[PDB]
Subunit: 199 residues, 2 copies
């Protein structure tokens, strides 16, 4: 790995296990196998290191979505979103160090947290842009405008993300035990969205 | 008003405008028209005062729901939830001092915030207990179990609450301008839930 990459990897691991406040650059350097001074060669400070690590992990998730989109782009949008949720769930289950790291954002210093939040937003754009265009292929139910359909999905996915985080954060074995039941539930919920939004 | 009630009223007003950290008991006493020492006669400290004020406002919202339930209990559950959302929205718009106060919870000291969060939960129980029993009257769509139906509603309402707060907190004039469009959207979304969940 390049020195920059070894550091970012170790940073994801140390921030994940210790949290933002208690993590030290000294700890990250040790984990990465580099002199303590090297962290400051590549990164201004702990804040910039955290930010770059958060961006590296987000970029990875963007890349997983890109790959999914190219392979599933012809599917009906409900079938597509269902499969994407299954893929997301399997990703989180198989990348526990990344998931642990991502949840630390809650407790990051207000300045850095504020600076980050919007980056994540910019980074889901492709998904909802896709949904918007694919809603155009549907025979939408009476009174269901393309705007209402998109807003409804946004709000439901927001609520699902919120409950998922509350339920599973820090609990990988619980997620492993619940996965099958969760997938079954997702399949049904996407069929409720399909049936309620289309004629 | 009783001395206790005058204080709680003023507390809702001062915490709403100044926030938890910057609000002082001295300011609340002045607002309430009582000697500074009286606050400590009724309340142990600022934390207990905030807690009792949050509970007083929550009790009020419980009472508004109770009144609604008794007057609308025979309605189909989708018609019922739609009308309840309309009533909630009109309440928030007509009680801006209460809404301003409620949103301060985010920034309350961790100990008190943790102690409070669950109280709000216990306090929406009647609603979801009602929804659970009323889902029994429906001819649910294939694959839609009463458990999946309840979870889907919970998650959607969570996402709606989250976006509403983000959009409208501190912005009463924006809510006033958007109300009509928001109500129209709610009517359609509840019809999508009805159509997707029932045969």
């Amino acid at each position: 790995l390049s020195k920059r990459d070894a550091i970012l990897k170790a940073a994801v691991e140390v921030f994940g296990k210790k949290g933002y406040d208690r993590a030290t650059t000294d700890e990250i350097a040790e984990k990465a196998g580099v002199a303590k001074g090297l962290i400051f060669h590549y990164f201004k400070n702990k804040e910039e290191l955290y930010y770059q690590a958060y961006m590296s992990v987000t970029e990875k998730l963007q890349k997983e979505f890109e790959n999914f989109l190219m392979k599933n782009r012809n599917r009906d949008i409900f079938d597509f979103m269902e499969r994407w949720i299954e893929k997301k769930l399997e990703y989180s289950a198989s990348h526990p160090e990344e998931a642990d790291f991502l949840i630390t954002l809650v407790s990051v210093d207000e300045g850095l947290r504020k600076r980050i939040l919007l980056d994540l937003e910019k980074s889901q754009r492709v998904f909802f842009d896709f949904v918007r265009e694919k809603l155009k292929d549907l025979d939408l139910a009476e009174d269901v405008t393309e705007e209402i359909a998109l807003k409804f999905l946004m709000w439901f996915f927001s609520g699902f993300e919120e409950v998922y985080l509350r339920t599973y954060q820090g609990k990988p074995e619980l997620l492993k035990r619940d996965m099958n039941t969760l997938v079954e539930e997702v399949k049904v919920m996407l069929r409720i969205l399909k049936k309620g939004m289309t004629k």
